Amino acid sequence: NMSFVKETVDKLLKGYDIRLRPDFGGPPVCVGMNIDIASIDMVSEVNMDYTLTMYFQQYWRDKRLAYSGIPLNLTLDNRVADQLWVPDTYFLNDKKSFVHGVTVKNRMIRLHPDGTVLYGLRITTTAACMMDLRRYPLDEQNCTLEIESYGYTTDDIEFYWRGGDKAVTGVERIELPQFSIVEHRLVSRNVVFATGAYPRLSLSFRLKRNIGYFILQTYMPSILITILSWVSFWINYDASAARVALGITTVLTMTTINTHLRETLPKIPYVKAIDMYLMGCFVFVFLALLEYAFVNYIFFSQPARAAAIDRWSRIVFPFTFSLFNLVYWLYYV
Amino acid sequence: NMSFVKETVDKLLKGYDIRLRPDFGGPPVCVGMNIDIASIDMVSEVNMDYTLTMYFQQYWRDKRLAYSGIPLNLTLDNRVADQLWVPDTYFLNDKKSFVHGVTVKNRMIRLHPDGTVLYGLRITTTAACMMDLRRYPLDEQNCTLEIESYGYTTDDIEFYWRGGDKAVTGVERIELPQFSIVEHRLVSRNVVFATGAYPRLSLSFRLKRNIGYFILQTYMPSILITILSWVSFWINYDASAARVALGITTVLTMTTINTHLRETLPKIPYVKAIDMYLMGCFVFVFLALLEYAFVNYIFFSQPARAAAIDRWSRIVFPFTFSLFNLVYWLYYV
Amino acid sequence: NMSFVKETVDKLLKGYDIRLRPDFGGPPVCVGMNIDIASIDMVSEVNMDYTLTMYFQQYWRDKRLAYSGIPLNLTLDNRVADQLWVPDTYFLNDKKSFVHGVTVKNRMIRLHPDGTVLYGLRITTTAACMMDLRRYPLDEQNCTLEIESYGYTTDDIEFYWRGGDKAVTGVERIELPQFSIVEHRLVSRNVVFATGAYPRLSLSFRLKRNIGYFILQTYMPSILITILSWVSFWINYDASAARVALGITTVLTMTTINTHLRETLPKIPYVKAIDMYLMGCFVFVFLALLEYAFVNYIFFSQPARAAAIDRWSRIVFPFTFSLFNLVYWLYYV
Amino acid sequence: QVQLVESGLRLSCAASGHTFNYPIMGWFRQAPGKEREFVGAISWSGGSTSYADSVKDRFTISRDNAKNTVYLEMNNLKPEDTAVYYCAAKGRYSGGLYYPTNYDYWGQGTQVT
Amino acid sequence: TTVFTRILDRLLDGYDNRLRPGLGERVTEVKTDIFVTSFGPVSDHDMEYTIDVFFRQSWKDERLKFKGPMTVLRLNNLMASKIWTPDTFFHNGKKSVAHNMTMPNKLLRITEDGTLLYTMRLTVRAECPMHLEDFPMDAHACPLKFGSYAYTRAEVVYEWTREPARSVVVAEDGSRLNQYDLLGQTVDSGIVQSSTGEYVVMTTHFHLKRKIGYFVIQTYLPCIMTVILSQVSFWLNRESVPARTVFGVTTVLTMTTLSISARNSLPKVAYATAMDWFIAVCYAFVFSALIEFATVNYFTKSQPARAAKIDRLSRIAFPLLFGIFNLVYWATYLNR
């Protein structure tokens, strides 16, 4: 009977005090939390953040809302959430959040006969993730979400993951364009500020970056240009114009590659692994041009010495480049 | 006397049903519209839209608001607009709109003794303009604003331009740096959807792009480089280094121009007139280098044939480039 | 005694009709205005607008708010501004404005015993400023802020600057990154639309662009490349490879400078002064390479004539470049 | 500041100075027994034109920015056109187009009959 | 007029909008249709698309049954804030807009027998996970899923207002696509399961195919002509060492410029697209042409016959291999 259900619902909210938490002045109210991760959008190194869309559910008990005589769980219109008490949960490390509002506010209130309240929201939040891009693009990041109570201390409210380690779902279904989620972790703790101790839940992911794109587009061109720089050692030192043209155009190509990578890669103003590799390649081609200049200086008075220097360079340059690559890839992997 | 005016207005609003349109259940209500254009701030080919700021005035009659004893047209505070019936006018092709709200909401309500309401808004609207850019930068666009009733069919509401062709004013206030308004048009019609037939007004502008910037910045560099590539035909064929350097560096200069023009120009992913011109110039410089390659191949055993090919190139290339330019500039203009 | 102040405030607001202006049906209300400029952030040439933050103060008199027995000026909570009549002031040439609202609505209401109301707001506004860039980057602009009444014509409201020319403060303190403020001006007038005559206040600034950055960055590289182009005249005319390499590489460098300086400069597509200078420099390097073409073609049979052409070019090219510079720097400066 | 001069059936208005702050030029005529009447208006830049209701298809307004000139050619003159003519400049945010008060700088008079 | 005011007030007398129609008795049944007014831009970088629609819902609520002179009441949209409406949301939505100028773009209509028609105008940004391996010869199926947020399948079900193919209608002029062709759409319904229960979901897939002309005229043709240029070097004289060296090194520089340019328009993905493979093969060919000249120049003095043979065989091998690779590449990626 719709009249009976209406009477029960507006009897529950008759003298309800939204200003007071359940069991106000008594023991803390326990709030369980569940998360369903719908998607993880753009991870950003320039902005040092990640966007996350989730279904965020909170479960608690409010004895003022217990009802009898109706053997059903009452899914109510979401607007009734403006008349109940709900926990003041917030995300410490978020920078911009919103609840979706098309075609209505993506909010759910479900009541149960013993006063149990289930409260769902759909949130897109841009949380802050500190990145350590010293080893970029061979880096591994750890990005978190910090769930906390703003007003209530541990004497008023306590959080827990409802379902243990199964509380958060949808992580294995996530696919990222540039990363791959190695692992995710759930943590429960307390944090003390000058105003008191508050309960804290933490959801962390460990992201590992994919290298194939970089191995194809930011390392192979530089390696090929450096190898092309060694072609000049096999040309006779008589051909001055040929060797000078080859060396100086190799330097120009290296400069072009570096300066366009600077504006293509994310603009992170400190040194990384890719920067060291590109600098090493630039130094190698500069040294090949320097070697030709030295040989050209002496090849008239001492022809045999210039020929010997060219022949030794043919061996030394590839071997030293291989050694440099070996040290680099052992240190950064 | 403030009290008499206040009681008159309170009487007018007392017993007023906002949920019902004027003459509800009877003949349709007629709404007259004026637009005074403050500006067209932006036209975007990347996003295919344009931003427009306007003063939008609506005129109608509601007999429930007819008042006597005060021979003055009551200019009321904007907040009173929240208590009356207004038409549910919308713009079908708008993506993002707002009513200016500093220092107060830019809204005006004025009443007349016979119950005639004048209702004014100040609106910035981004409206979608689908552009055929196949002739860019020599293109001509047509951008429209569609004004419709969302909820009321032709049985309920009727639109008209108040003042005929003088309804929309301020067209001369439009200052687009790269376009120039050719003509604006007013149209009135009906549109049928699965829910019914609705009145429609349409305000359209014709835009002509300014070609001078593109001639100075895009066509002249390519023309000069293509001409420079013909210098090779006047250099003796024994000078292999000079002619090879000239040809390959003209190819590199054309490639640099095209690749940088791809970034500088708005990203319109299909073929336009400028792309055809640049590809034609690239083909021309490529053919000049090919001509030298052939001449250098055959010049050792048949000097007469090589000299003849050089002499004929000196005429054929300028003539063919002139013909290509003639066809292009006759087709696209 | 807070009770007496509370009852006085309640008495003032009891029976108060916010929909009617002071002296409704009588003489117009005179509103004085002050502005304190706090910053001018970004004078943009792409969008042709500027951002301005200010403290906007309005003064008027309302006898309905006159109180006695309290020898104080009542600074009230800003929410009481929602219970009074405030002028419908708006900025006629704004594109997007807001009133700051952290930590609360940045707004002030101060009442005086005789009914004088002081109403303060803190506003950040983006305002349109149409720019004549035909002399860029040697240009001078004039940017305005227009203040008008949206609903009340001159039969109801009047505007004036409070303090005369001292009304607007903080202009001398402003430090724009790329301009310098030369003079600001205050104007009061009337403006007639089809709906009637409205009061208008106008605050204008005159800006002169700083040029030293462009001299060091935009003009000198082009001048140096053009000077380097004349080195070809001092190389022997039989050295084909050296002279052709020099000419075509200077053409490539000039092209690189132009294509990468169009991106740095504002992307407003029409001609400017720097564009003309860059095109002149491009034409000069092009003509140097063409001159070598002539000399190379002629020198085989007429060495004296070719040497004469080179010797004359060594004087003609710098002289004509100096003449071009003289005409340019007299036409624009 | 914009200085306006008149020349010249045909009339020509030539302006000098800060013609960018005043992008719109307008023609007005004053009758002894009436008020000043709007005749036409031309934008310096875009070239868009507006005319009065009683001067359509008879008077025409054009512009050449090369010498900063705006031209008004008059055809099929009628006896009701005996008035003293003026050319005026209107600011960018000066309001309506048909009202002489909105125009800042006015030219000198001219009799046509 | 006052008659209709009385009827409207009588309808809302004791009405409880917190409760769905037929709560505790039956299942609320909602019939839906979509009129797409414009299929907006598709973004590969954000993996999403935009779409503007009229979203129409219909259901039955006996509490709003009335009787009067008119059969249907076409009410103002504010009335919809006083009755129960479905809480439909788009599962893959990202940030949608319920349009609000100059009034809320909503219509509510009540038939005399209690049928509610509720329509609104929406701009929906939806996520479209794309597999860009075959870029730019890739076809996509961008989805749009909607359903109830709080009511499970035991309380609220959704159905298409007519046969499912005819319940999503795209306007004739409604296509804001620049680099895609909208081939068609398929329409379906199903059940989804979440931790809070079983829900009904209504799905539409829009099938798109990228247009290739821009990339051909911007990337493929310049790269092919650069490779042909690099192979043209084999016909120059072995004696002109500076000429052939300048040819090879400047062709490498041109290929580097072209590939750097083509990298900017390519979406950032870990895997290699088709364009990446093409660019890599062109780069390898140009590099090999320079290495071939170095080899020929090595033997040009001591073994001239070998140098001539290497040049002569290269003049055939390089074009043949490039033609074979082009044939294989286009055959693989065009009849996919």
Added chain:
Amino acid sequence: TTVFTRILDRLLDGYDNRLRPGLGERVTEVKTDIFVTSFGPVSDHDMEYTIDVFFRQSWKDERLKFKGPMTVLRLNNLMASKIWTPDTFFHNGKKSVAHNMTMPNKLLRITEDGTLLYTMRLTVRAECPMHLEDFPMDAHACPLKFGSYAYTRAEVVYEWTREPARSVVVAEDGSRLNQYDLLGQTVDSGIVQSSTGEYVVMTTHFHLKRKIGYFVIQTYLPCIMTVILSQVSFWLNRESVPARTVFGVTTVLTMTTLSISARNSLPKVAYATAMDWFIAVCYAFVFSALIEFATVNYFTKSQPARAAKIDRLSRIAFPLLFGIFNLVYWATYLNR
């Protein structure tokens, strides 16, 4: 349960939130402190910085005394909307955010004697006027000033809740700076005057020092090596005219590429930074090397001794001048 409801109702019985505490009798003393959870990004282009704070205020309102079983009421944030709160604002704030997910991030606590503790979580974008004549070796002192918008010094005053140096506390892991080092902070208070009266202002300066390694590895070293490469040309044979011409002109082009790239990372100011001077001097050196080759080549067939002399003197003159310039430049900009 009902006891606290009636306590709150009695507290709000007759309370006027339009009147400040102690109005007409004393000065409302407000104590303030700030907990910086993260010092956000600093932008040179927009001349601003972001900062995320817990902003805490505390004052006394005699109208809000109570007696009950508890000494402190730790209430909902909505209660704060019903009482008088200070109208604090940030004098150089640009566009700040009071966070609102999932509820308003505010807490109000009332003590039995009438003491109010009021805390909110904010994100503030604030102006930081930067002098960039020493870029990229520039240090800045970004301010943050706050105070009452409407209440003059005779009505509301502000104090730091403890010692001024200990009232602004930065979290250990709260530093989102990639380009700068947060050296420290200075905390002060003062008085400002304006057209409306005299106001108390509270100031915090955050001292930032830019990190230079990125520009050393990206701009300074390539420019230095390009200049050294240009000066290497003096050691090539004079008879090798095409070689030396190609060397000089291609080095000029390489310097042009480097200068263009380094010119996009600079902030768009209208004066000369340290980077601009370095780049200009390097450009001049490369240009002068090419001019020197031209001069030497002009004398090779008429006065070979003079050409040899010019080359052998340039080989010493150019490196010495470049080294002296580098010593002066780094001594000037690094000891500063």
